[PDB]
Amino acid sequence: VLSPADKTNVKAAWGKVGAHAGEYGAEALERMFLSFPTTKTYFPHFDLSHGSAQVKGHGKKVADALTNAVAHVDDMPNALSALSDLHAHKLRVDPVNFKLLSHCLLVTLAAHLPAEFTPAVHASLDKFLASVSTVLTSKYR
Amino acid sequence: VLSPADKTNVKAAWGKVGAHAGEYGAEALERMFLSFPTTKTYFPHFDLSHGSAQVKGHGKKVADALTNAVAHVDDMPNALSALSDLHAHKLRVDPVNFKLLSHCLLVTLAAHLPAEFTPAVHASLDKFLASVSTVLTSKYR
Amino acid sequence: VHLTPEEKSAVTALWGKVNVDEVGGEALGRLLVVYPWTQRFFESFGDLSTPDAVMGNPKVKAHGKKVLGAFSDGLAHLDNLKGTFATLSELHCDKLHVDPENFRLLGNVLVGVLAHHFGKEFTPPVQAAYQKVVAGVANALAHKYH
Amino acid sequence: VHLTPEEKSAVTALWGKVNVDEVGGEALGRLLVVYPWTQRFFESFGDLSTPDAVMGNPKVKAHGKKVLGAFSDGLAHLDNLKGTFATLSELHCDKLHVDPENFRLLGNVLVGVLAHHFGKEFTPPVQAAYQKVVAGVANALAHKYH
């Protein structure tokens, strides 16, 4: 579960992301396609070229779903309801894959938040990405 | 989430384990150390040889724990509060090992319940063990 | 894969008694009931909304027998899992878009099925030799991914 | 491991700028904070009660530099990590009883660290190259488990 401090810590790092979310989000996805190339099996109908509009848009959608979760940290299931349904019933993405993106996102924040990515901010972020992943996977079966 | 049918399927199945629960516990540990050798890393103090009374008695404790899990299917976090503090703050077993025992445990049930190990029954049990694993690993961080 | 004389003997002996038709089918069906998300690759297969439905569907049975039959040839070429499955690895990657994690999930349900089928005869040591086989097949398959 | 010439040069060049001891201590320190169950091996290092305690601990730091120097000598032998890490692998299994998952944990915490240290120089392709190196090492360290 997320402790009080965890929430303060996400809300702080994320605030800092500010307007770049969409950009960060696109960077994460490309980090993932390069690192874990099996994750591409889920995007066969995307142009996964670098700078592709497809990747940049989806990047922005991802980041928006994250800001929202950040906004409704005390109520994620609710806040992501529509999203867990989609991933569960439509995309049917194997739960392993959520670890992979979370990792890639964490690397993305690291590279862009020198001053803020303290060991404790890092732990709280790792946890929140775990919870986001658990909420999104919860209706799979 | 455990649906009323999953609950019914679990009670049902576990009920046929009956008195063999401990016996099945041990066999599960056993399949576990031979299948996934890395898990032995946590019992360097046990005689892991076949017939080992330490395995046997450990098998029995696990089993009894699952029994108590079944009995309290609606309030597992409470019923397993002590086990979760233990695995998390003392043993500190990597979460990834909960999956490996859960599999060896499904495997043992299958091999002993040729009639009740229906595909449906197979899914409610795996649901059940993944929740039990979730509970035990909920206080790690 | 590397298996002790003991392990090959146990793998192969159990395999001689497996009905590739019945087992393939059970294995595939149980994949789709236990981990429903895998149903995304078989959109064009029939009703898959019920365990009865899955388990009773001719297309699933059909597929199962083909998977197992493929698996069977790996067994026979335990020494060269990679070279044996390279073509099907490329198939599943470039044409099918199957996340190789599914290989794993299948490898596990197969163990479960042999266990259910064989009971006692599927002993800890026998399980272990099969756990290795399936892991090997799942890696020979994920091998051409890129 | 399996690295194109370009990937090797990439790995080799950033590495040239790492302060081994500093990063070593950071990664290890970060491991103990992010994934606290890893602390189980380090009870004789003393206070690990807070993130500050962990990061400030001379024992963690000293342990970090030893782990990172070995990793570092590893790079010289990308061609044969299994060769290079065989004894150590034997040690973590037989005498330390370190579950090879921890290695996978450190590998990723390490990547996080490189990313935080180098920022923008840590591009998506630099990350990929590193991700192969770290999975290769963790594999090589787990090969003699039994």
Ligand code: HEM
């Ligand atoms: C925290 C993790 C994730 C979040 C917040 C997330 C969020 C989203 C959102 C908001 C959408 C689109 C909804 C709309 O169109 O507005 C979506 C779609 C999608 N996601 Fe996820 N997602 C996550 C993880 C994953 C992972 C791990 C994968 C697979 C590797 C995945 C694959 C997909 C695909 C293929 C689509 C549809 C793309 C298209 O065809 O438009 N997602 N996700």
Ligand code: HEM
């Ligand atoms: C549902 C899964 C599990 C259940 C129900 C369970 C239950 C138990 C119980 C009842 C105890 C003894 C506590 C006491 O005597 O107060 C125990 C201890 C222990 N467990 Fe677990 N356990 C689970 C999973 C794990 C896993 C996956 C591992 C590692 C591979 C693990 C490693 C240990 C060890 C090392 C101990 C202490 C053994 C000794 O030194 O006496 N457990 N567990």
Ligand code: HEM
């Ligand atoms: C694990 C070992 C596997 C083996 C050896 C294997 C082998 C095969 C074979 C031999 C074919 C058909 C080509 C022919 O008709 O000769 C095939 C097709 C296929 N496989 Fe795999 N398979 C495996 C697992 C999987 C898994 C886990 C999935 C996803 C659940 C999958 C998805 C597919 C699909 C969708 C097709 C084509 C179906 C169609 O065209 O109707 N396979 N596979």
Ligand code: HEM
């Ligand atoms: C690439 C990953 C790693 C490498 C290269 C590595 C390397 C080393 C080396 C070189 C030593 C000392 C060898 C000797 O005294 O002969 C060692 C000791 C040790 N390592 Fe590892 N290590 C790794 C990961 C880890 C992890 C992740 C853990 C636990 C979370 C760990 C736990 C230990 C412990 C407890 C010792 C003994 C410390 C002592 O007795 O002073 N190692 N490691």
